[PDB]
Structure formats: structure tokens, C-alpha cells
């Protein structure tokens, strides 16, 4: 009665600590990290379709400000908006800015359908020094600045665009706020002005607000931009006695809107990834990440923990 057989298990010199229900630090033979804490220093242009706005944010892109011509016809899964983007035109605001930005970004393309508006008597294509294009006074190339005729006339405008296409139309238009009563009359004769844009079931009415604003690119006036969506089987009516910044057409809206926008200064590179944060793309399989709450695409879920180790082996008890 002398031979002996022993049953046992493997071990390593130095294992990895993991958490359980009952212990914050248990040494196991092998483990796998579930939190991704590294990012790429660049944005991957594949397999998602990225469009770099460069010096234009998505709002000035849509208005057609100087320097945004490269965005014409662009299509994107993710619009890349740059923090150092700058205004290069007449000073403006958008009462529901984030909402318009959301719509443009979500839609995912800049497909503009030009249209002829038969405006009456009034002069078209007004320009400004605040919006210069190659040293020449210009304006938003998607917008049409209406002013009084040489005969000092600004008659009531009353125009209709009917939509019997198979897509919803996005009309972007604006109302100009002069600095003084003089500027008001000098531009639009009538005082006060007024704009009313309406569909069958919705409407927007704006009365201009005359007053001095801070000087921006040599202007105390402001343009406030609005938008109107026109569904198939609907129609839009523009009504003005002054101060209208008219559209030159409409943007096409996709029926299905699948896109978005990402604001970051990180440059676009040559890598391949379907997950993008504002800190750069991720190339990982881990189920979680702690890099940024701002993440677009096929991404790990954002968590606060810097590390969460999944045990992939038994307890390590060496010797």
C-alpha cells in the first residue's frame, strides 16, 4: 500500500486581481479587461461616411456662407463640425438654433433644389460688406436679400410654392433687423416691415425689431433665420411688406433620417473604425469604454469605471 496519485490544478507566479460579490481583490490566473481606455488620435473615414466642415459649421454650410462651397452636395453619416469654425458673413442668429442644427445634421445631406421666385417690383440679390467674397460685397448664396425698387417702392409680396414631389421640402428663410429707422426706410421703404410664412397647418409670423446691436463686421443690424418644412400635398406661402430674406429654393429631406453631427478638433486619418468619439475613433471589441460620453456609431457603452477585469481563469495559488 504505497503508490499515490494526486489531483491538482495549474498556477502562475503572478496572477491578476478581480472583483467578485464578496471580495474586491481576488487573484486569478488570467483576466480580460472590459473597459476600453485607449483611443486613436484620429477619426476613421471608413466604413462610415465622414464630411469635414472645416471652417464652416453646419449652420453656415446650409446658409451658404463664404468658404462653405465645398459642402455643396455633400452626404454624410457623421458631419464633423470644427470648434475653430468662424462666421464669414452678415451677423445672424437662429431663435431655435439647436433645433435647426439637429434637423440639418440628422437629415444627412446638403441637396439643394433651386427655385425661381417671381418677386414683384423689389430689387433682388442685395449684398453686404460684412459678407465679402474675394473682396466683393456678397451674401448667403442660398438666400435672396429683397430691397425696395429704384422707384422707392416695396409692395406687398404674395407668392406660393406648391409641393407635389415625393419628398418633404426644407425652406430656410430670414428676417432682417435694421439698426435705425433710417436704415429701415432706406432698405424697405415701409416702416414697419413684416413677414408671414405659412403652410396649410402651420405658420410663422415675425415683426422686425429696430435697434442698435454690437458692431460685427461693420454692421449693427441682424438677420434672424427661420425654417419651414413642407410635406408632399402641402404648399407654402410667403407674405411680406418688408425685411424678408428670401430663399432661393429648398433642401431635400430624406424620408428616413439616420445621420448625426460630431463636434471635435481631432483630424481625419486613414484608419478603419465604426466608433467615433470627440476624442477620436475607437478600435476595440471591449463592451465598455471610459473615454467619452460623446460617442457615435458602433461603440462600447460608456461607463465611469477606469477598469473592470473579467476573470478568464481559476484562482491563482502558486508554489
Amino acid at each position: 500500500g504505497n503508490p499515490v496519485i494526486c489531483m491538482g490544478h495549474h498556477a502562475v507566479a503572478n496572477g491578476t486581481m478581480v472583483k467578485t460579490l464578496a471580495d474586491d481583490q481576488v487573484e486569478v490566473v488570467t483576466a480580460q479587461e472590459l473597459v476600453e481606455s485607449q483611443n486613436l488620435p484620429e477619426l476613421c473615414p471608413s466604413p462610415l461616411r465622414l464630411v469635414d466642415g472645416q471652417t464652416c459649421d453646419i449652420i453656415n454650410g446650409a446658409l451658404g456662407s463664404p468658404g462653405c462651397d465645398h459642402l455643396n452636395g455633400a452626404e454624410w453619416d457623421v458631419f464633423i463640425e470644427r470648434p475653430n469654425a468662424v462666421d464669414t458673413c452678415y451677423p445672424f442668429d437662429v431663435p431655435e438654433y439647436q433645433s435647426l442644427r439637429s434637423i440639418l445634421a440628422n437629415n444627412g445631406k446638403f441637396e439643394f433644389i433651386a427655385e425661381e421666385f417671381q418677386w414683384n417690383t423689389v430689387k433682388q440679390n442685395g449684398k453686404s460688406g460684412a459678407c465679402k467674397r474675394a473682396n466683393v460685397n456678397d451674401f448667403f448664396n442660398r438666400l435672396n436679400w429683397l430691397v425696395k425698387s429704384d422707384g422707392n417702392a416695396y409692395p406687398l409680396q404674395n407668392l406660393t410654392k406648391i409641393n407635389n414631389g415625393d419628398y418633404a421640402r426644407l425652406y430656410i428663410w430670414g428676417v432682417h433687423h435694421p439698426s435705425t429707422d433710417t436704415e429701415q426706410t432706406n432698405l424697405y421703404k415701409n416702416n414697419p416691415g413684416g413677414v408671414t410664412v405659412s403652410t396649410k397647418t402651420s405658420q410663422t409670423s415675425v415683426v422686425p425689431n429696430i435697434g442698435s446691436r454690437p458692431l460685427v463686421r461693420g454692421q449693427s443690424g441682424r438677420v434672424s433665420f427661420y425654417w419651414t418644412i413642407v410635406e408632399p400635398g402641402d404648399l407654402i406661402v410667403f407674405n411680406t411688406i418688408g425685411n424678408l430674406i428670401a430663399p432661393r429654393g429648398h433642401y431635400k429631406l430624406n424620408n428616413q433620417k439616420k445621420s448625426t453631427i460630431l463636434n471635435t478638433a481631432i483630424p481625419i486619418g486613414s484608419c478603419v473604425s465604426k466608433c467615433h468619439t470627440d476624442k477620436g475613433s475607437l478600435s476595440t471589441t471591449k463592451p465598455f469604454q471610459n473615454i467619452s460620453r460623446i460617442a457615435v456609431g458602433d461603440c462600447p457603452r460608456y461607463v465611469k469605471q477606469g477598469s473592470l477585469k473579467l476573470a478568464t481563469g481559476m484562482r491563482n495559488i502558486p508554489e
Binding site: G1, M7, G8, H9, H10, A22, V28, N316
Partner: protein
Amino acid sequence: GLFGAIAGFIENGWQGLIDGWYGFRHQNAEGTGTAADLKSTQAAIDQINGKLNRLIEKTNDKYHQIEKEFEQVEGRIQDLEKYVEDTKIDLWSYNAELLVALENQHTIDVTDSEMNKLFERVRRQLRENAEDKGNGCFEIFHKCDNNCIESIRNGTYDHDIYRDEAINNRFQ
């Protein structure tokens, strides 16, 4: 572990066992040896892989969401957006924290279990021919050469062959 084998009656692991998770260590008249057990090792590995596959599995494929960074406070709506995202993050961080803990606790219990299963397997092979020494080792009460040892490891050991010899040694 629930079964008390690993970090239990098995005093420690074997750093020399490098081609398996579980195995055999013996001493007879011919010498000593260590050999990995394939079935036990594979069983542990497969179940851990199942966890890995189910865990590193599903997409979370999101595009247009909400703003999550803000230059200046705006009030009510921004408060709600910030509150929504912060609420989301805490819940998922909770989910992750609990998930890993649950998996790890289960993983340790599985591996400890697979250890115990192997010991119990060999125990049943040996019948009345051996006695549990208490440290995961069986005292074999008959001559057992290398062929005999291998027959135990590969499951062809026939206890009836050595029973008379073994019983006589045990109780006299």
C-alpha cells in the same frame, strides 16, 4: 469556491502544469510524473468562452442622440438633458460593475467545481483499492506501474484486477 477544492483541500496549484488547467501528479516504484487532464481542462475553458462570447456580443449602434456638452447654462431644458445623460451613465456603470462581479464569482465556482469533479471521477474509478489522504491525493494500496497509472488517467483502470491485493493491504 463553493466546493472547497481550489484554495481548499488542494493546498496550492502547480506552476509546472503548463499544458493544462487540471491534471495528475503521481509517485510509484518507477518514479514521479505530472500529466494534464484534457476533459476537465476543456470543460472549464468552454464555459469561460461562453461567457466571453455572450459578453463581447452586441452592438449598441447609436447615431443622432442629444447634446452632452454645454458652454454656458441655459436652464430647464439643458438641466433635463444633463440629468438624462447622467442618469443613463450611472445605471450602465452599475450594470457593468455588477455584471463583472457576478461573472467572476460564477467563474471561480465553476473552476473550483471542475477541480472537484475530476477528484470525484478518479475516486469512483479506484473503488475500494485506494483511500483519500485528504489533500487531493489517493493512497493506492497495490503496486501501480506507469501503465497502471496511465490506465487511471485515461479511464481504462479496472479495479477488479487489483482488488484482492488492495483489500488485503488496506485491512491487514
